[PDB]
Design an enzyme around this catalytic site. Structure first.
Site, mmCIF file in Angstrom:
data_model
loop_
_atom_site.group_PDB
_atom_site.id
_atom_site.type_symbol
_atom_site.label_atom_id
_atom_site.label_comp_id
_atom_site.label_asym_id
_atom_site.label_seq_id
_atom_site.Cartn_x
_atom_site.Cartn_y
_atom_site.Cartn_z
ATOM 1 N N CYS A 131 -1.580 10.144 -6.742
ATOM 2 C CA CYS A 131 -2.748 9.922 -5.932
ATOM 3 C C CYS A 131 -3.806 11.219 -6.127
ATOM 4 C CB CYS A 131 -2.472 9.930 -4.154
ATOM 5 S SG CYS A 131 -3.825 10.019 -3.397
ATOM 6 N N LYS A 144 0.849 -1.272 -0.071
ATOM 7 C CA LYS A 144 -0.038 -0.076 0.032
ATOM 8 C C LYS A 144 0.876 1.200 -0.020
ATOM 9 C CE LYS A 144 -3.453 3.085 0.626
ATOM 10 N NZ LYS A 144 -4.247 3.315 -0.391
HETATM 11 C C1 LIG Z 1 -9.222 0.400 -3.212
HETATM 12 C C2 LIG Z 1 -8.311 1.167 -4.097
HETATM 13 C C3 LIG Z 1 -6.960 1.701 -3.327
HETATM 14 C C4 LIG Z 1 -5.801 2.084 -4.061
HETATM 15 N N1 LIG Z 1 -4.645 2.458 -3.630
HETATM 16 C C5 LIG Z 1 -3.528 2.925 -4.214
HETATM 17 C C6 LIG Z 1 -2.375 3.295 -3.857
HETATM 18 O O1 LIG Z 1 -2.323 2.914 -2.670
HETATM 19 N N2 LIG Z 1 -1.418 3.625 -4.349
HETATM 20 C C7 LIG Z 1 -1.539 3.595 -6.018
HETATM 21 O O2 LIG Z 1 -0.543 3.958 -6.733
HETATM 22 N N3 LIG Z 1 -2.693 3.346 -6.644
HETATM 23 C C8 LIG Z 1 -3.681 2.849 -5.693
HETATM 24 N N4 LIG Z 1 -4.870 2.549 -6.278
HETATM 25 C C9 LIG Z 1 -5.038 2.897 -7.860
HETATM 26 C C10 LIG Z 1 -4.731 1.098 -8.460
HETATM 27 O O3 LIG Z 1 -3.394 0.763 -8.008
HETATM 28 C C11 LIG Z 1 -4.812 1.334 -9.856
HETATM 29 O O4 LIG Z 1 -3.811 2.034 -10.526
HETATM 30 C C12 LIG Z 1 -6.472 1.547 -10.338
HETATM 31 O O5 LIG Z 1 -7.033 0.963 -9.619
HETATM 32 C C13 LIG Z 1 -6.482 1.320 -11.815
HETATM 33 O O6 LIG Z 1 -6.308 -0.300 -12.094
HETATM 34 P P1 LIG Z 1 -7.759 -1.215 -12.055
HETATM 35 O O7 LIG Z 1 -8.425 -0.727 -13.309
HETATM 36 O O8 LIG Z 1 -7.096 -2.611 -12.210
HETATM 37 O O9 LIG Z 1 -8.497 -0.907 -10.764
HETATM 38 C C14 LIG Z 1 -5.860 1.951 -5.532
HETATM 39 C C15 LIG Z 1 -6.918 1.624 -6.223
HETATM 40 C C16 LIG Z 1 -8.115 1.301 -5.423
HETATM 41 C C17 LIG Z 1 -9.473 0.391 -6.328
HETATM 42 O O1 LIG Z 2 -2.630 6.767 -5.623
HETATM 43 C C1 LIG Z 2 -4.139 6.266 -5.271
HETATM 44 C C2 LIG Z 2 -4.323 6.229 -3.836
HETATM 45 C C3 LIG Z 2 -5.531 5.580 -3.577
HETATM 46 C C4 LIG Z 2 -6.054 6.115 -2.120
HETATM 47 O O2 LIG Z 2 -7.122 6.961 -2.183
HETATM 48 O O3 LIG Z 2 -5.358 5.883 -1.313
HETATM 49 N N1 LIG Z 2 -6.494 5.634 -4.451
HETATM 50 C C5 LIG Z 2 -6.046 5.570 -5.805
HETATM 51 O O4 LIG Z 2 -6.873 5.506 -6.581
HETATM 52 N N2 LIG Z 2 -4.893 5.812 -6.157
#
Ligand SMILES: Cc1cc2nc3c(=O)[nH]c(=O)nc-3n(C[C@H](O)[C@H](O)[C@H](O)COP(=O)(O)O)c2cc1C
Ligand SMILES: O=C1C[C@@H](C(=O)O)NC(=O)N1
Ligand SMILES: Cc1cc2nc3c(=O)[nH]c(=O)nc-3n(C[C@H](O)[C@H](O)[C@H](O)COP(=O)(O)O)c2cc1C
Ligand SMILES: O=C1C[C@@H](C(=O)O)NC(=O)N1
Lengths: 312, 313
Positions: free
Chosen positions: B131, B44
């Site tokens: 983010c 995370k």
């Molecule tokens: C629940 C949630 C939490 C996420 N937390 C992070 C994060 O901590 N850091 C990050 O770089 N991306 C985070 N993401 C973004 C994902 O890493 C990813 O880039 C984005 O969801 C697109 O991919 P997907 O279409 O497979 O969901 C998060 C996404 C979601 C769904």
């Molecule tokens: O980089 C991030 C952070 C994460 C969050 O809100 O913690 N949610 C995202 O979609 N991308």
């Protein structure tokens, strides 16, 4: 119960219209849109001279939406101006004319000639600041200084109410800055959110190939892919531009989708991809579906719920 | 036929991993990801201090994808550093550690402490510049001067290979500028495209309400909504950064989606929304489905088709 409304000193039978670029390039297209049940129509974004546009294939549709790199193929401003001045039956519905010059000078040249026709006929200008498909020409409204210059120059040359077709934004700071720029211009009476989501890429797994020819396959996205983005932009501008109208465009396939746009703040609702795929019959279906949702909820008017999306 | 990769001086059984933020916040989550059939895992995105994150509800999923405004809830850098130092079984698979400080100073502070652990254990840094969910903090990489500052400062303080989690762009000029900035930094060895599509808005028709609480309902989009956007960004950076690796993230639900990312130029393929919804069993399914496509096409290795998307003449 009916969907009739008044905006911009015009009366509309319902809030539905085509999105610019869809079913609106030729006289035939425009006659077809006029004969449809839509509340209004808008002409293809035009340039000072006719354009062939980008090489084919340049539009492809899929279950979740469309990709396009049309490249502003159009019959030229002279034609669309003539349609507005001589050909359109204003007793049927209002007309918007979209322009998308490739420079501020080109836009200024067009609006100077549009002005007398706007004065005489009441045709409404939509200034397109968000075309993502002409090679080497980035979306104007992604450059806030360029955006300001275009709006200053067009305001001074036109001197009449107009609206702006905006690109989608994805950043709160950008919503803030974009809306503040728009709010500098009292002649900007409506804001259309959104144009296609720029420079996506669709790849076919079987052929291992991109599906459109221009720009190595990169094109603007529309349809189901973009609905939450469109709603966000509609609502962001509705909140930030309380003295302007917002028109919603993006991801509308049903009366329910239109209902969401209106909840977010939309006055008019434009239909692109779904109209391209289904044809102008879509307008009777959208009207029927919107009225059904309204009846189920006990809404008698659009004003009862426009912009009334609830937060938690 | 095989899915093996050898990159960044590590060996991976297959290209699949979680997307940062999904199934990777607690020790339990990380052990679960380690036990899965994924080729790697990432922790995370963390901050110097532990964070509760934004108010709930803050994640919602739908047939076409997800919306989230988590707000960087995390156990704090000390925890993720300890996990990388003491707890992770590197014999199972490689580990990436994601950081998302709220300022350049916070990132610098973390990387100074991460460096000796990266040197000793081989944990790989993913610097999150995208983010979209912390109120008052716009995506760093949408400001190219800020992006350069962060990369300059992190490069100097860390001094080791790292990667960058990028936001989606929608403008050719932005692809050009962003990639040019990245290319100034030889320590940036991989580029992960993409983070969520920022500040979308999902509205429920029946209740006439937004579906998440933070920021008046505005949250990052993932899943089916974003696949063509993700592919575009993967390919744009693959073309513009020929001396770096690109990791694909966005809209992966199937081996076919993974195949498209790899055609576009992806080395590793990350899974967010679909993993959140399906759970870690997804990894065996993705592996089987990708191998089936490869078999049908006569591809024996990933290198035979990586980046080989055809354009129309
Ligand atoms: C629940 C949630 C939490 C996420 N937390 C992070 C994060 O901590 N850091 C990050 O770089 N991306 C985070 N993401 C973004 C994902 O890493 C990813 O880039 C984005 O969801 C697109 O991919 P997907 O279409 O497979 O969901 C998060 C996404 C979601 C769904
Ligand atoms: O980089 C991030 C952070 C994460 C969050 O809100 O913690 N949610 C995202 O979609 N991308
Ligand atoms: C075939 C095609 C041509 C388009 N041409 C224009 C154009 O001339 N001017 C413009 O402002 N938008 C144009 N658009 C963008 C649409 O007006 C609309 O903003 C976008 O497609 C999103 O709406 P949708 O999800 O209903 O498709 C075009 C879209 C497509 C599909
Ligand atoms: O504004 C525009 C222009 C159009 C085209 O390529 O002609 N395509 C679009 O998606 N939007």
């Amino acid at each position: 119960m009916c969907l009739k409304l008044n905006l911009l000193d015009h009366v509309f039978a319902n809030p539905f219209m085509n999105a610019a670029g869809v079913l609106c390039s030729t006289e035939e297209d425009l006659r077809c849109m006029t004969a449809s049940s839509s509340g209004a129509l808008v002409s293809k974004s035009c340039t000072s001279a006719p354009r062939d546009g980008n090489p084919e294939p340049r539009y492809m549709a899929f279950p979740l939406g469309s990709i396009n790199s049309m490249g502003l193929p159009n019959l030229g401003f002279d034609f669309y101006l003539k349609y507005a001045s001589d050909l359109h039956d204003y007793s049927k519905k209002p007309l918007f004319l979209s322009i998308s010059g490739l420079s501020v000078e080109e836009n200024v040249a067009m609006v100077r000639r549009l002005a007398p026709v706007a004065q005489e006929k009441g045709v409404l200008l939509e200034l397109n600041l968000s075309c993502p498909n002409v090679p080497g020409k980035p979306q104007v409204a992604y450059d806030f200084e360029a955006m300001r210059t275009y709006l200053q120059q067009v305001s001074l040359a036109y001197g009449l109410p107009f609206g702006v077709k905006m690109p989608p934004y994805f950043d709160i700071a950008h919503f803030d800055t974009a809306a503040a720029v728009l709010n500098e211009f009292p002649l900007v009476k409506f804001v259309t959110c959104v144009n296609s989501v720029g420079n996506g890429l669709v790849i076919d797994a079987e052929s291992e190939s991109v599906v459109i020819k221009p720009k190595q396959g990169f094109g603007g996205l529309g349809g189901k892919y973009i609905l939450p983005t469109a709603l966000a932009n509609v609502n962001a501008f509705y909140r930030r531009c309380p003295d302007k109208l917002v028109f919603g465009c993006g991801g509308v396939y049903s009366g329910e989708d239109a209902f969401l746009h209106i909840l977010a703040g939309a006055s008019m609702v434009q239909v692109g991809t779904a109209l391209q795929e289904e044809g102008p019959g879509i307008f009777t279906r959208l009207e029927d579906e919107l009225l059904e949702i309204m009846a189920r909820k006990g809404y008698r008017t659009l004003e009862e719920f426009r912009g009334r999306v609830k937060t938690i």
